[PDB]
């Protein structure tokens, strides 16, 4: 599709420009962005003279990577000097560069699989990092982000051991749970002195603690249902607090 | 299959959160229940039929669930604003046609329709969020409702068959409404801080220029300026949040 290709490359170039600005002076980040910008050029040349279908796959792959380096650049900014998050970023960066190298050397299905995981991990570390920021000085919210980060550490080691689906599922849990923490920390600031809104936020927070613990206990169907509900309720209460003033 | 179980797990969460965000709205609940139905059939076909058809059917359901989650979010954030309500119902309508196209059989046309609907669903939710973060700011509310007009232009361009021009326009809508949201959140976090306020003002002026350039038809340059603005809005929203 010649007009669809132009559209996907437009998005890829936006993500790449933004990632490069977000990456600032970080060498690993700048290197990944530069590597991916070069890969977009290779998809465009392939489009300009070669096989449109090969360019399309090349380009769809560049798009996933650019999404991932965008998320990793955001995490690295938000994380500042937190050593655990910096260790995570560096690991995701390592995996993404290996994804690209594997893709360049022609085994595209195995690198596309790797890239899927990298993107989820990059989304996970970005919302964890943003949740740390929003939790501010609140120890209960910090303690929860600390657990959720540890679950993220486990997912990467789990993937390296070959249980891809379990690790991916664990990234999915990590992304939603740290997103709820962000929402809940936002809600408790948007509620102020209002005692109804504070109580409503506390109850939801208790539902997150329950869902995190169910997941750690291994009943995943129930824990995922609780998390999805928490997210909707945290959203609804954050919206309601925003509107009372 | 390992991928299929993880895909149904993601679709389930999106469907579960969309039900709660639907509340008692019947049009949104109709949409949720309808996508939940297709998820079950997908899982019934993986259970008692061909697994290859179930996974193409599940990947469609999963995009539908992301879309319906976005629109239900947007419907909540719209409150009683008549432009946004109207946009939401228009995307709900388009989403229903897409599902109905897939349920009949033209799966490739369902998928290209659904790809578009998911973008409009994303764009209308960020407009909605940005309108809330805009609060009582008249400058920001103008821009947001400006961006929503761009959004309405896209849906009709697409309904006329110029599919890729319209996709480019939603893309612009989403990054621009997103940038407004970031600038608004950063202004709220900065309080009265002299420098942070000046820095937010600078970014707003570059966002208006990007919008202006896009309206002139210089897409390549507007996309560059917008991608730049979004990174700069984000860095400044972080330094502000790291203050208060």
Question: Would you write up a description of this structure?
Answer:
Two copies of one chain form a homodimer. In chain A, 90% of the residues lie in helices and 0% in strands. With 245 residues, the first copy, chain A, is mainly α. The first copy, chain A, has two domains: 1-134, no CATH class; 136-245, Up-down Bundle (Four Helix Bundle (Hemerythrin (Met), subunit A)). In chain A, helix 1 runs antiparallel to helix 2 and helix 5 (108-135) packs parallel to helix 7 (164-190). Chain A starts with a helix and ends with a helix. The PDB classes it as de novo protein. Keywords: design, homodimer. The assembly is dimeric.
Topology:
2 copies of one chain form a homodimer.
Chain A: H1 2-23, H2 27-49, H3 52-79, H4 83-104, H5 108-135, H6 139-160, H7 164-190, H8 195-217, H9 220-244
Helix pairs in contact in A: 1-2, 1-3, 2-3, 2-4, 3-4, 3-5, 4-5, 5-6, 5-7, 6-7, 7-8, 7-9, 8-9
PDB class: de novo protein
Keywords: design, homodimer, rosetta, symmetric, designed, circular tandem repeat protein, cTRP, chlorophyll, Zn pheophorbide a methyl ester, Zn, DE novo protein
Assembly: dimeric
Which key features would you list for this structure?
homodimer, 245 residues, mainly alpha, Four Helix Bundle (Hemerythrin (Met), subunit A), 2 domains, 9 helices, 90% helix, 0% strand, elongated, de novo protein, design, designed, cTRP
């Amino acid at each position: 599709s010649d007009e669809e290709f132009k559209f996907l490359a437009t998005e890829a170039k936006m993500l790449i420009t933004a990632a490069e600005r977000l990456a600032g002076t970080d060498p690993e980040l700048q290197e990944m962005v530069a590597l991916i910008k070069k890969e977009l050029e290779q998809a465009e040349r392939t489009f300009r003279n070669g096989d449109k279908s090969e360019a399309q796959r090349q380009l769809e792959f560049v798009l996933t990577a650019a999404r991932a380096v965008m998320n990793v650049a955001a995490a690295a900014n938000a994380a500042g000097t937190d050593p655990e998050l910096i260790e995570m970023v560096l690991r995701i960066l390592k995996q993404l560069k290996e994804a690209i190298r594997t893709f360049q050397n022609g085994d595209q299905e195995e690198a596309e699989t790797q890239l899927r995981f990298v993107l989820r991990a990059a989304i996970a570390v970005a919302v964890v990092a943003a949740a740390l920021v929003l939790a501010g000085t609140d120890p209960e919210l910090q303690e929860m982000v600390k657990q959720i980060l540890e679950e993220l550490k486990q997912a990467i080691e789990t993937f390296a051991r070959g249980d891809k689906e379990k690790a991916l599922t664990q990234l999915l849990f990590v992304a939603w749970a740290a997103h709820a923490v962000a929402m809940i920390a936002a809600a408790a600031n948007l509620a102020g002195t209002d005692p109804r809104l504070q109580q409503q936020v506390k109850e939801i927070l208790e539902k997150l603690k329950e869902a995190i613990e169910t997941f750690q206990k291994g009943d995943e169907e129930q824990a995922f249902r609780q998390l999805a509900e928490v997210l909707a309720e945290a959203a609804l209460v954050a919206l309601r607090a925003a509107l009372t003033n």
